[PDB]
């Protein structure tokens, strides 16, 4: 039902400030870009949820299968009574069920950008696990990790390879910051999508049904609405690329003809040449050996490594 603690560090004026800043900088760069965090308004979050069920998008179900078959082992290794989830599901329940089965579950700490979603989880989870304490935190995981409570022995999970949506420099910064908040008896469960057949990688971000394309183009709808811009969404083509040098998927939006875009709120006018491409997201893919090193660099020791038989996806347990 309604039992909940919820702390909110996301102000609408701060969000507006950041978007203006991001869009001005991104659209005036010789190589245009937009940060992917702006994908996730209500519509875009819905579209991502649909992406997780696409035939081509293996990551969610691959990760879920690993959690499904190793839930007990993960929870036994963590020895936690508190689950901290950065980014909010079926995956969630597997972990919580295992903690409950082990008679360890005391507390659930969801960390997400949408307070509404957090409130819904508080009710659902509160109902599913009677007596559980729920302390929700509305924040962005790049700035408010220090606001996460430290009560209990905490299993901090960052699933879905969302860590791959940060380029190396901010990624290392995030991991270090996160590691610094862990006490003895705390653990990090990190999901990393792994280097694999490049055809499979591109198809996962360029599905036949055009759902990912809609997800990508929606960032233009967000800008149109929030900054009073006039992007013609239909004029932009969805492009997914494998960058072999950086070993990352990239999502681009390509102007199929010359476009003139006015962003009224920024007193800004911007031009796209025919065939000009704008970078909207990276999805970095990892090699198993490099996951160990990136954790070590952040001050975390990898104590467990779970991966599906095909080696498509990896889950790390790590501690200070
Ligand atoms: C959120 N992150 C894990 C997703 C974002 C995504 C999914 N499809 C397109 N972009 C990924 O990089 O796979």
Curated annotation (Swiss-Prot):
Q: Which Pfam families does the UniProt record give?
A: Methyltransf_33
EC number, as in UniProt: 2.1.1.44
Keyword flag S-adenosyl-L-methionine? yes
- One example of a Gene Ontology biological process annotation: ergothioneine biosynthesis from histidine via gamma-glutamyl-hercynylcysteine sulfoxide
> Which GO terms fall under molecular function for this chain's record?
L-histidine N(alpha)-methyltransferase activity; protein methyltransferase activity
Q: In which pathway does it act?
A: Amino-acid biosynthesis; ergothioneine biosynthesis
Keyword annotations of the record: Methyltransferase, S-adenosyl-L-methionine, Transferase
What InterPro entries does the entry give? EgtD (IPR035094), EgtD_Actinobacteria (IPR032888), EgtD_Methyltrsf_superfamily (IPR051128), MeTrfase_dom (IPR019257), MeTrfase_EgtD-like (IPR017804), SAM-dependent_MTases_sf (IPR029063)
- Binding positions for L-histidine per the UniProt entry: 57, 165, 205, 281-283
Q: Which residues are recorded as binding S-adenosyl-L-methionine?
A: 87, 91, 112, 140-141
Knockout phenotype, as recorded, reads:
Cells lacking this gene are unable to synthesize ergothioneine (ERG), but do not show growth defect. Deletion of egtD from wild-type M.smegmatis and a mycothiol (MSH)-deficient mutant does not affect their susceptibility to tested antibiotics. The ERG- and MSH-deficient double mutant is significantly more sensitive to peroxide than either of the single mutants lacking either ERG or MSH, suggesting that both thiols play a role in protecting M.smegmatis against oxidative stress and that ERG is able to partly compensate for the loss of MSH.
Reactions catalysed, semicolon-separated, are: L-histidine + 3 S-adenosyl-L-methionine = hercynine + 3 S-adenosyl-L-homocysteine + 3 H(+)
Family membership: Belongs to the methyltransferase superfamily. EgtD family.
HAMAP family tied to this protein? EgtD (MF_02037)
Looking up NCBIfam families in the UniProt record yields:
egtD_ergothio
Its domain description in UniProt is:
Consists of two distinct domains: a typical methyltransferase domain and a unique substrate binding domain.
Q: What does this protein do?
A: Catalyzes the SAM-dependent triple methylation of the alpha-amino group of histidine to form hercynine, a step in the biosynthesis pathway of ergothioneine. Among all the proteinogenic amino acids, only L-histidine is a substrate.
* Protein name per UniProt: Histidine N-alpha-methyltransferase
- Report the source organism: Mycolicibacterium smegmatis (strain ATCC 700084 / mc(2)155) (Mycobacterium smegmatis)
